[PDB]
Structure 1
Amino acid sequence: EVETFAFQAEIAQLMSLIINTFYSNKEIFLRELISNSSDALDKIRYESLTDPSKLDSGKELHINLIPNKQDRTLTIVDTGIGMTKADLINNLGTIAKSGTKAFMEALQAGADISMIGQFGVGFYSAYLVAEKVTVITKHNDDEQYAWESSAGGSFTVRTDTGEPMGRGTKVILHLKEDQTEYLEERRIKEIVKKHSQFIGYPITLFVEKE
């Protein structure tokens, strides 16, 4: 059972800009997704201080980076707080608490796309390198869901079964054909060292089986 939703207009406009603006410094997408994971880990860390049972779904707080050249995917996995179904729909589908409006105004007034994280919309930088993004997520208060969008103004949400996570979020980037550099181990290492070296959780780069 798949539900289809329209992005809020301003989010569709933001996505279109990210997809269509000429901008070569695409590598910042990884910093933005890792920062979102770090925020999610901070949140479950804090909540678990006063309710240790919130870690029954996994004590380890970390980030995994999983390249797969066969599938042309890069996946960013965390064991953070995760998202409920409502969280997915509100947080990824609408302006919500973000600075979407301020960012689009800023770009008209001299800002550039690398500043996207200052405005709380770094997630959408995924579309610098991905033709499709799938978000698998599990919150302690809810079942596992899959959010998906290839932009074009809509996204889908469905329940996700058969491969349960304990808790957290997986952002699966189905890369554009000319963005496969982000599957290369030396490139990923370079970007993590350059932009994410102070993140306060372990970041493990998986090795490919092929």
Structure 2
Amino acid sequence: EVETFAFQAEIAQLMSLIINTFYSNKEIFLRELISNSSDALDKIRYESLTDPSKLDSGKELHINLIPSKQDRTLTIVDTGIGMTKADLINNLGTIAKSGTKAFMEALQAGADISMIGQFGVGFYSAYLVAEKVTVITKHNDDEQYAWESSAGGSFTVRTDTGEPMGRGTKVILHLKEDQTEYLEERRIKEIVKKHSQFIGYPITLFVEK
């Protein structure tokens, strides 16, 4: 069964801003999502040092970038700590309220959309390139969930019954029709080299079949 939730007002207005503001430098979404993956991997690696059983759901700590021209999706996969149901429905948004308000005020005070990560809400940069984002995620001691939103003020959460992932997060970017350059191997290599060269986990750019 599918539950539908309203975004907090401040997040809904930030998402509209990211969708409606004219900003050509859209490629920064990838740096932000890789940064989020890296942070998630840091967290589970740190926790595993006092409770090694936290890696029973998988010892590999990595990031995969998977384009699909058939599906017009770019997927960012990590084996990080994952997100709980409470994370997805309430707690990440509660944390994000402060930075979202500060980011919006900074934008009026001359700041640039590329600074979104400095306010801790970089996930929403996905809507620079995606008409819809699907997030599949699995945290130890919670179930595997699918979060999804095409903006418009609402998101859904459901228990996922696709291929179990062990632990981690998959961000599936359903790309806008004029943003398919982010399916090109060369374009992704260029972006990762430029913004993400010093990430401390293996980043594998998968190749289209």
Give your verdict on TM over 0.5: yes
Deviation per CA, 1:89-147: give whole Å up to 9, x if none: 12554454651111000000000100000000100000000000000000001010000
| Runs of at least 5 residues in structure 1 that lack an aligned partner in the other structure | none
In the alignment, the residues of structure 2 paired with residue 35 and residue 191 of structure 1 have an alpha-carbon distance, to the nearest angstrom, of: 13
In the alignment, the residues of structure 1 paired with residue 136 and residue 154 of structure 2 have an alpha-carbon distance, to the nearest angstrom, of: 17
In the alignment, the residues of structure 1 paired with residue 96 and residue 178 of structure 2 have an alpha-carbon distance, to the nearest angstrom, of: 32
Could you say what secondary structure the match of 2:49 adopts? helix
In the alignment, the residues of structure 1 paired with residue 136 and residue 23 of structure 2 have an alpha-carbon distance, to the nearest angstrom, of: 28
Distance 1:94 1:27, change over 3 A: same
Residues 102, 119 of structure 2: 8 Å contact kept: yes
Residues 76, 171 of structure 1: 8 Å contact kept: yes
Residues 103, 119 of structure 1: 8 Å contact kept: yes
Q: Percent identity?
A: 100
In the alignment, the residues of structure 1 paired with residue 172 and residue 41 of structure 2 have an alpha-carbon distance, to the nearest angstrom, of: 18
In the alignment, the residues of structure 2 paired with residue 185 and residue 140 of structure 1 have an alpha-carbon distance, to the nearest angstrom, of: 33
Residues 96, 120 of structure 2: 8 Å contact kept: no
- CA drift at 1:40: 0.2
The within-5 A match list for 1:85-96 is 85-91=85-91, 93-96=93-96
Residues 132, 151 of structure 1: 8 Å contact kept: yes
In the alignment, the residues of structure 2 paired with residue 34 and residue 58 of structure 1 have an alpha-carbon distance, to the nearest angstrom, of: 19
In the alignment, the residues of structure 1 paired with residue 67 and residue 190 of structure 2 have an alpha-carbon distance, to the nearest angstrom, of: 14
Distance 1:79 1:97, change over 3 A: farther
Deviation per CA, 1:136-161: give whole Å up to 9, x if none: 00000101000000000000000001
Could you say what secondary structure the match of 2:95 adopts? coil
Residues 98, 121 of structure 1: 8 Å contact kept: no
Residues 10, 97 of structure 2: 8 Å contact kept: no
Number of residues of Structure 1 aligned to a counterpart in Structure 2: 209
The within-5 A match list for 1:1-210 is 1-91=1-91, 93-96=93-96, 98-209=98-209
Residues 10, 95 of structure 1: 8 Å contact kept: no
For normalisation by structure 1, the TM-score amounts to 0.97
- CA drift at 1:199: 0.3
Deviation per CA, 1:7-43: give whole Å up to 9, x if none: 0000000000000000000000000000000000000
- CA drift at 1:207: 1.1
| Runs of at least 5 residues in structure 2 that lack an aligned partner in the other structure | none
- CA drift at 1:162: 3.2
- CA drift at 1:194: 0.2
Residues 12, 151 of structure 1: 8 Å contact kept: yes
Residues 29, 128 of structure 1: 8 Å contact kept: yes
